Design an enzyme around this catalytic site. Structure first.
Site, mmCIF file in Angstrom:
data_model
loop_
_atom_site.group_PDB
_atom_site.id
_atom_site.type_symbol
_atom_site.label_atom_id
_atom_site.label_comp_id
_atom_site.label_asym_id
_atom_site.label_seq_id
_atom_site.Cartn_x
_atom_site.Cartn_y
_atom_site.Cartn_z
ATOM 1 N N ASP A 43 0.788 -1.316 -0.006
ATOM 2 C CA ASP A 43 0.092 0.007 0.051
ATOM 3 C C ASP A 43 0.779 1.042 0.012
ATOM 4 O O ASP A 43 0.586 2.285 -0.525
ATOM 5 C CB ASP A 43 -0.952 -0.016 1.157
ATOM 6 C CG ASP A 43 -2.176 -0.688 1.086
ATOM 7 O OD1 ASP A 43 -2.757 -0.916 -0.017
ATOM 8 O OD2 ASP A 43 -2.404 -1.329 2.027
ATOM 9 N N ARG A 45 1.254 3.787 1.824
ATOM 10 C CA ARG A 45 0.677 5.125 2.097
ATOM 11 C C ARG A 45 1.416 6.307 2.126
ATOM 12 O O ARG A 45 1.025 7.510 1.475
ATOM 13 C CB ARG A 45 -0.446 4.958 3.465
ATOM 14 C CG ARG A 45 -1.502 3.885 3.219
ATOM 15 C CD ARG A 45 -2.284 3.689 1.828
ATOM 16 N NE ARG A 45 -3.223 4.897 1.714
ATOM 17 C CZ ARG A 45 -3.829 5.263 0.715
ATOM 18 N NH1 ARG A 45 -3.527 4.556 -0.367
ATOM 19 N NH2 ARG A 45 -4.612 6.270 0.857
ATOM 20 N N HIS A 97 0.575 -0.729 9.003
ATOM 21 C CA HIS A 97 0.114 0.893 8.968
ATOM 22 C C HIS A 97 -1.652 0.407 9.352
ATOM 23 O O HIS A 97 -2.231 -0.277 8.685
ATOM 24 C CB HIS A 97 0.108 1.627 7.844
ATOM 25 C CG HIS A 97 -0.505 1.060 6.503
ATOM 26 N ND1 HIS A 97 -1.496 1.657 5.850
ATOM 27 C CD2 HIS A 97 -0.386 -0.207 5.672
ATOM 28 C CE1 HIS A 97 -1.993 0.771 4.949
ATOM 29 N NE2 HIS A 97 -1.144 -0.304 4.648
HETATM 30 ZN ZN LIG Z 1 -1.287 -2.203 3.706
#
Ligand SMILES: [Zn+2]
Ligand SMILES: [Zn+2]
Ligand SMILES: [Zn+2]
Ligand SMILES: [Zn+2]
Lengths: 214, 214, 214, 214
Positions: A43, A45, A97
């Site tokens: 991901d 982020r 996360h």
């Molecule tokens: Zn993730």
């Protein structure tokens, strides 16, 4: 943004560096082995470099869905063995996360296809800590699972033959279990830091205990 | 830099954002699926975000040693399937880099341990293009292998059941094969861009042909 | 035959052994490590025990689709490492068979699902020996691919870190490449027998050469 | 027995079949897809064919150390997908055996090398059923773990996307969990037979419950 925009921005970025930060690649040019191995989620982020302020070349990186360290995943194990035995990194950071799509999907169990097989490793963790999770407010269970996942992966990595042999021959390598949220980008140390076989077992139980309280 | 310095810098970084770029996480907070999947090397000499100028949350990322897409690596395949079928990314970028430690180790063949098994996939590529490589100046062979590796991984990804089925049902997903060097951080398009089964085969041969000339 | 028939036949089989071959399990009861490791196809057209006349307990066995030894398949590598380092087997036999469904599917390339990813390793072999195959009568190409596949897996196994280290420390372990057909159940030695790093390379080329003639 | 003896016995075996059982390969010659998929241990103490009385060609086979069905093992998953979707087997049998070297090694935890990573999946099972095991006599704990391992693998296989989709589209496929011992070669049904998503969950709990009593 489209593809042409990335190539064009890169070309302009490269040129601008000459008259803004000419020594940008000086560090890179010099064969400098990374001191940190970062295992995070695909991901991504917030980039690890931005979260910590590390410069390019200072970290070796592996990213997969939900930042897992499966006992038998040769992709991840190969990254670790190379980092530990060849690059001799001194710190390994497994960072999860809050709000991770992988963690959530593992709980909701939607039919997503092939990825569902990978996610079953997370469901195993969810079952494992069922009692602990049912002892906390509902709104905090998913975030807690996110933390438990990181702790279990730290535990898994510590038990791999790679880490066991490294610590056995007296090599200095520390494993850390962190997590951050998108609300403030603040790193949170889950306090399961392991420097050897003994602290691995001790800090693991410690981490789980700090949750029984929370 | 040590561990305490990373945690401390992160704490200060987070605070500074409030009065420097308060909306930094605004994008992240808003569930925005990435449009790009980046498959790169764990070396991560120059972050993909810095190379392209992409903002956090715009890319899904997987990194392994020498940015490989092995036919049977479920770690990488799981990232791809999730990205293509669930996040529905529109572009997949496989990016290698000149001077990659993995590529070099595959050629020199030193005894490094477990990682040597992973690297044999690269030696297979080196054998495959033996004639082509012997047709070019020695000083350029390692860099050329680096490019050939990327092209072969693009080819591998395109032949996975994941990509074949996506293109078959008419989904719009493009694969790109890039490479960059530490001398200038300039992205180089190997021109093997595939948008469907036909262009995959055509551009692959095209890429190899452009090397016969070079 | 149905499930109840297997359980019932087993119960009767067990009883009959007492007054027909009471010492049947005597060998098994005695902790006797196998001397041979057999890597074959899941098709198991003719059991290895029947083909060779080996008794139960004399062989360690691994079977997968098309008897492959993928550089990065931890399932197969784990079987080999255990067999070589722990059981200390003296002979490893990779046995393919003519008419193998896996080999054929890799050539015809039908859409079978997940298995297609596993089979791409065979297509890589088919591409690799394209010239050699086009130099022989069409009716013999599929059977030849079956043999080439075995030879390539022997080569792959010999290059794994497991075999390289075993031969390096002077352990006695031999690898054989065989194949059999359903027309007569006759084992065919592809003559690629390797006892060390040198013979591995020599016999491999030897095997390929004997085909150039055939 | 040595290599020459196996090749020689095979040659003589093949000849003898002509004037002892000429139609031995008749079944094989006729493209007859197997009805059973057998997942067993590489130890192969007693061949599955001998245990059940099945003829060659009636079963598809996969064997790995300790007969595991790891959520993310593509080797095993590829065998299953091929068997279920292509061969359309009707029964899948996961069979463990008492005294399995893999199961024992997972408990004693000796330093064996690479295989230790594969075995950690078994230690996870041992931890999972800690309370249950401590509720039974010590001399029976290892044998019980052997049974628990089989039940967990049946559970794992049932949760793979392969089995979930097959049962979802209404395909008839049954999974069985068996175990046998070298003292009598008697098959023991652990009674966790699953024919669909519902019975998978029900019989799993059933199997665990029957142990609480035992
Ligand atoms: Zn993730
Ligand atoms: Zn690299
Ligand atoms: Zn076969
Ligand atoms: Zn066993």
């Amino acid at each position: 943004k489209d593809i042409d925009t990335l190539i064009s921005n890169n070309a302009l970025w490269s040129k601008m560096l000459v008259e803004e930060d000419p020594g940008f690649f000086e560090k890179l040019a010099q064969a400098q082995k990374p001191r940190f191995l970062w295992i995070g989620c695909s991901d991504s982020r917030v980039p690890a470099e931005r979260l910590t302020g590390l410069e390019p070349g200072e970290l070796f990186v592996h990213r997969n869905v939900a930042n897992l360290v499966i006992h038998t995943d040769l992709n991840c194990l190969s990254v670790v063995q190379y980092a530990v035995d060849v690059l001799e990194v001194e710190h390994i950071i497994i960072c999860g996360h809050y709000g991770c799509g992988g963690v959530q999907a593992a709980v909701e169990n939607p039919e997503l296809g092939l990825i569902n097989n990978w996610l079953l490793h997370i469901r195993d963790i969810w079952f494992k800590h069922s009692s602990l999770l049912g002892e906390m407010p509902q709104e905090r269970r998913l975030d807690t699972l996110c933390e438990l996942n990181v702790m279990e992966q730290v535990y898994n990595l510590g038990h791999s033959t790679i880490m066991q042999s490294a610590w056995k021959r007296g090599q200095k390598v520390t494993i850390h279990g962190w997590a951050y949220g998108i609300h403030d980008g603040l790193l949170r140390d889950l306090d399961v830091t392991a420097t050897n076989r003994e602290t691995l077992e001790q800090r693991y139980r410690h981490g789980i205990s700090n949750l029984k309280l929370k």
